[PDB]
Amino acid sequence: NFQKVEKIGEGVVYKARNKLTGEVVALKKIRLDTETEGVPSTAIREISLLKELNHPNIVKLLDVIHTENKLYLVFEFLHQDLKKFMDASALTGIPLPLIKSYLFQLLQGLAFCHSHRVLHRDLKPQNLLINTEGAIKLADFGLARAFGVPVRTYTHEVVTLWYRAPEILLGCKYYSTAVDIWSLGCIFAEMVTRRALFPGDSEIDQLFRIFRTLGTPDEVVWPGVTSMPDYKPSFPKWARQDFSKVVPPLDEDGRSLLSQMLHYDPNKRISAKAALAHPFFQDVTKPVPHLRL
Numbered sequence: 330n331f332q333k334v335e336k337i338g339e340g341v342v343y344k345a346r347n348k349l350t351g352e353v354v355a356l357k358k359i360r361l362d363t364e365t366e367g368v369p370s371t372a373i374r375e376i377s378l379l380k381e382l383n384h385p386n387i388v389k390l391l392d393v394i395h396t397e398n399k400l401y402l403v404f405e406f407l408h409q410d411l412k413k414f415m416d417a418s419a420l421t422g423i424p425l426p427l428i429k430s431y432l433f434q435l436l437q438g439l440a441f442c443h444s445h446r447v448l449h450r451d452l453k454p455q456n457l458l459i460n461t462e463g464a465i466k467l468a469d470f471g472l473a474r475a476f477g478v479p480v481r482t483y484t485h486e487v488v489t490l491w492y493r494a495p496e497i498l499l500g501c502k503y504y505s506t507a508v509d510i511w512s513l514g515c516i517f518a519e520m521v522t523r524r525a526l527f528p529g530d531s532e533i534d535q536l537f538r539i540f541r542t543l544g545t546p547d548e549v550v551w552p553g554v555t556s557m558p559d560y561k562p563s564f565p566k567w568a569r570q571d572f573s574k575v576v577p578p579l580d581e582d583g584r585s586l587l588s589q590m591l592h593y594d595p596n597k598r599i600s601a602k603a604a605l606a607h608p609f610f611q612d613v614t615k616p617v618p619h620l621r622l
């Protein structure tokens with residue numbers, strides 16, 4: 330009874346409406362690399378469990394449907410995302426109390442999925458859904474390949490690297506939950522400054538933009554970095570910039586927390602659970618955004 334109303338993202342995502350009840354959902358259609366072989370059972374097993382793992386700051390997975398050549402994921406629908414909201418707020422800034430609320434909520438959602446050994450892997454502002462009630466939710470998890478979904482390969486894919494953790498760019502074979510903390514730290518700085526922190530346009534440009542701000546990492550601040558697969562001794566050596574320059578005019582509580590979310594060493598980067606205890610959040614509230622829907 331659900332019909333496509335409108336394309337809302339590009340898998341490709343549609344606003345779908347029930348032609349009798351009015352109910353609206355987000356329908357995500359993921360094309361596969363095969364026309365006949367469908368999705369392996371083990372991937373459907375892993376995806377399906379997330380229907381029963383719920384948190385207020387994670388988008389709700391409503392149904393999973395698979396065919397010989399497609400995977401469909403049905404999600405709850407929200408009208409807006411943080412990318413759109415920052416663009417609408419870009420000339421003035423999202424107010425600090427709302428920045429703080431959104432960051433706290435996103436840490437709550439990450440603490441939940443990391444506690445269940447699920448990573449997001451691809452956090453971006455456009456993947457963070459917001460509503461009129463002040464909630465923000467993690468969406469568009471980068472789980473297709475981790476679960477074994479045989480997604481269609483795209484030979485000329487243009488990937489946004491801006492939020493990617495430096496251990497990923499240096500070729501780490503195993504990701505940790507810390508990759509999501511890095512991405513969220515980047516998004517935190519973007520809401521504060523109204524500009525993306527590290528908008529690189531290739532993997533080496535992404536790395537060098539990080540290096541020119543936080544300093545070229547070495548064994549002193551990131552033990553093991555020089556053994557990472559894509560580390561090069563010939564990297565240019567940039568001095569570290571102070572966080573007072575990176576995120577003015579964030580107060581020292583916020584700068585403190587941001588420095589721990591952007592720690593080079595993923596083993597020392599603050600956990601989502603520990604970040605919730607940070608003094609930055611001692612006056613946190615739940616304001617509402619003014620949305621033009």
Ligand SMILES: O=C(O)c1cc([N+](=O)[O-])ccc1NCCc1c[nH]c2cc(Cl)ccc12
Binds near residue numbers: 376447
């Ligand atoms: O967002 C997507 O596009 C997506 C794509 C695939 N995929 O393609 O394999 C699988 C899952 C996806 N989302 C899961 C969202 C979710 C609901 N409840 C959760 C509980 C935890 Cl702990 C962690 C995550 C969730």
